[PDB]
Amino acid sequence: GMQIFVDTVQWKTITLEVEPSDTIENVKAKIQDKEGIPPDQQRLIFAGKQLEDGRTLSDYNIQKESALILLLTLR
């Protein structure tokens, strides 16, 4: 018996319970609890624009069932 490795790229869905009053900073904290990703490495993207840590979900008119994209980079 022998062993080989297969690398493939795709996506993954992280589901979060949030309030519209929540700041982006708090949303990144919820992502850290579930996935282990430190917030400074999280780039959250909605409407082709990255979201500031100061603002809230309501500020971006992010509503029920919204789909955000997470890219991981240094900053």
Place this chain on the structure above:
Amino acid sequence: GMQIFVDTVQWKTITLEVEPSDTIENVKAKIQDKEGIPPDQQRLIFAGKQLEDGRTLSDYNIQKESALILLLTLR
């Protein structure tokens, strides 16, 4: 009290137990067993060459701890 979804990219490494006599076609079946991608959509790449379903791992000089690249192409 609301719910939002965060889609993030996952780059995944799959570990398979195989024999060198196993065909590429069989390897794709194992990938289907583990990750659920049907073999018709699997493109396996090793040493810059795409693998024909007919040949075996020994035919491609794929040895212990060899690393393959998987690309997904639809119908």
